Design a binder for this molecule. Structure first.
Ligand code: MG
Lengths: 78, 113
């Protein structure tokens, strides 16, 4: 029974953007760029989470079938 | 570290002969005297079954080969380099206990692939 959510969200307005400076962000790059063992471990994390590739599905894909480039595609094909 | 190990083996991996001449608190021995003793004990012309006869005031001491674990330093260096280059430890002709078996093996070879 709310359109706008009626509960507040701890926004650090007194911190102007965010508490993250560009210097903090660029220090993440410094760790990533550095090579050696710590950068390699975080690369292994990326490869485990995302390295095995992906597949697109649409539930009821066949029913979407439409002439796009004057020829049939489903939304998954598109 | 590799250069350091090679230099360390050259100095410390092999025992070296130390002939001490003269009596302790006795008469001093000068360089020209040691030249003649050096000629007697020269490792260049000594052979495996040479024997020595001396007065009491000549001591054939030795520098032992001073034990250090260069194998462990090599294993550490190779672990550092292979992991830095993203290769498995096994690529460097170095291995580790447990990691050659079961799910520990399966993970590292999965990461490589
Ligand atoms: Mg005297």
């Amino acid at each position: 029974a709310s359109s706008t959510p009626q509960t507040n969200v701890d926004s650090m307005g007194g911190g102007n953007g965010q508490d993250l400076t560009f210097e903090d962000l660029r220090d993440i790059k410094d760790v990533r760029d550095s090579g050696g063992q710590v950068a390699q471990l975080m690369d292994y994390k990326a490869l485990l989470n995302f390295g095995e590739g992906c597949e697109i599905h649409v539930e009821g894909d066949d029913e979407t079938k439409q002439l796009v480039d004057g020829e049939p595609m489903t939304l998954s094909e598109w | 570290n590799e250069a350091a190990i090679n230099q360390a083996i050259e100095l410390h991996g092999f025992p070296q002969r130390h002939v001490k001449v003269g009596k302790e608190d006795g008469a001093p021995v000068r360089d020209n005297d040691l030249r003649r003793v050096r000629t007697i004990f020269d490792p260049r012309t000594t052979d495996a079954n040479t024997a020595y006869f001396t007065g009491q005031d000549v001591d054939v001491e030795t520098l032992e080969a001073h034990n250090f674990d260069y194998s462990a330093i090599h294993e550490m260096d190779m672990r550092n380099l292979t992991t830095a280059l993203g290769l498995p430890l096994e690529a460097g002709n170095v291995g580790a206990d447990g990691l050659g078996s079961g799910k520990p093996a399966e993970l590292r070879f999965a990461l490589l692939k």
